[PDB]
Design a protein around this ligand. Sequence first.
Ligand SMILES: CN1CCCc2cc(CN)ccc21
Ligand SMILES: [Mn+2]
Ligand SMILES: [Mn+2]
Lengths: 137, 137
Amino acid sequence: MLSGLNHLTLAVSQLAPSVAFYQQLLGMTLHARWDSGAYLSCGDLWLCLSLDPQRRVTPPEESDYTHYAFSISEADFASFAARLEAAGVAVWKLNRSEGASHYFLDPDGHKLELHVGSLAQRLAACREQPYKGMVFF
Amino acid sequence: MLSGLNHLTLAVSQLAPSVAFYQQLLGMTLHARWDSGAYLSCGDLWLCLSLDPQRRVTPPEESDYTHYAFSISEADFASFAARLEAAGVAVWKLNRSEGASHYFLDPDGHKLELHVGSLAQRLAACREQPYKGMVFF
Ligand SMILES: CN1CCCc2cc(CN)ccc21
Ligand SMILES: [Mn+2]
Ligand SMILES: [Mn+2]
């Protein structure tokens, strides 16, 4: 039986700029780097960057809604989002609201998000302002 | 600062087969569903399925190496892999590393993995037998 996420692996087109993005800009911990990959952590998350010549830099209008959200506290959210905008990080748009979030792209067009709040808080907010057709189990 | 992964959102082409896969086949807990999505949990992982008309059922040869690995114990690994094989789930890669991994596809072609072992265990193995160009920090 499954117990959670073991690791997230992102395919990247150029290793050095991607390591710089996740380590220098987002502040993840770099544990190891080799000619074709890197291992980073963010709290409990094991992130692997894997050099892949198949990876294409895709505009957000032509990629689907698959995306990866990172937790940040209420106190740090705005100042962290402001730092990303000042660094010229591009944005993308989701079709629906899901609370306090900032949506941004990595150098290869992976869709990232900063989000404040847990699943439990999201469900409680949705009880008051449900999505269309929502049912709770 | 970022404190971990908040949620993983997968774009899906049809909600019902994706809920069946993640809830019934993989055993994740379904918390809520609406006209265009669902929220599930797997241990401490919050998973969102988002219905997206942009999502193509993508063959594994046409997508890059980006993938999502779930944690499982060694004791449960072989029986879980056998369950996936009985259900007809396609495999996209053979395991060619030491640790136990099973590489399988979801109904829309998202690349998934079952993996036994932590980052610390991988780093220890790599310290003994480093990859080409490997530097530790
Ligand atoms: C940390 N550092 C900066 C200079 C380029 C570079 C390359 C590798 C892979 N051979 C590992 C570390 C590193
Ligand atoms: Mn999100
Ligand atoms: Mn993997």
